[PDB]
């Protein structure tokens, strides 16, 4: 693949709690993506794994679903168990049963805690599928947003909010992140979360419109 770099441009803000707040300015301490961060850009034409640094911000903008099925295994071999979070257009399987995978794992189209299969009905179904993955206290939380764009050059100068989807208990020592390819071209951005303090502005309808990163520059420290 081809590795590039692109500025984040105030992207990747989600809902920190399942509580309706309207016309307030709430300050929260949660694993966020910092403003104007140095995220990477991948042009998949080939493909090793990635280090799962406490959260992955996924910002694929092209169509199709060749990049689906990201697995969250610690070691993708025997002895120590591997976690399988394969996603598809039919079903999602959340399995930890060791298995065996290569140094460049992929889905070839042509033990301890098995089954635990979910249906993923909202995922069953300008395609900017902005995704945020998290692992706090063994739980698995998915934040998603489908936001249209005018031009597909770079990330736009706007704002978006991300809503939580699921909650799956795993509780293992996840250290590295890996996407899977259903081999029988792809442009996607990867961002890494960080413990940061945000000041979230809810409107009168209860949605986040503006935010301020409290540890970016002294002006934002004064604002917070």
């Amino acid at each position: 693949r081809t590795q590039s770099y692109t500025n984040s441009f105030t992207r990747g803000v989600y809902y920190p709690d399942k509580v309706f707040r309207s016309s307030v300015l709430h300050s929260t301490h949660d694993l966020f993506l910092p403003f104007f961060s140095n995220v990477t850009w991948f042009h998949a034409i080939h493909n090793p794994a990635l280090p799962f640094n406490d959260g992955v911000y996924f910002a694929s903008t092209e169509k199709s679903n060749i990049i689906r099925g990201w697995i969250f295994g610690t070691t993708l071999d025997s002895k120590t168990q591997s976690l399988l979070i394969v996603n598809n257009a039919t079903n999602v399987v959340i399995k930890v049963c060791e298995f065996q995978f290569c140094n460049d794992p992929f889905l070839d189209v042509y033990a301890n805690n098995c089954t635990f299969e979910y249906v993923s009905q909202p995922f069953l179904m300008k395609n900017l599928r902005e995704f945020v993955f998290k692992n706090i206290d063994g739980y698995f939380k998915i934040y998603s947003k489908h936001t249209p764009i005018n031009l597909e050059r770079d990330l736009p100068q706007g704002f978006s909010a991300l809503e939580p989807l699921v909650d799956l208990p795993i509780g293992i020592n996840i250290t590295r992140f890996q996407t899977l390819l259903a081999l029988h071209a792809a442009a996607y951005y990867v961002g890494y979360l960080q413990p940061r303090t945000f000041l979230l502005k809810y409107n009168e309808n209860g949605t986040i419109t503006d935010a301020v990163d409290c540890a970016l520059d002294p002006l934002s420290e004064t604002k917070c």
């Binding site: 002895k79 168990q81 063994g138 293992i172």
Partner: peptide, 9 residues
């Protein structure tokens, strides 16, 4: 050890 962690190896 981290809290709520299980050791197998």
């Amino acid at each position: 050890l981290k809290p709520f962690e299980r050791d197998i190896s």
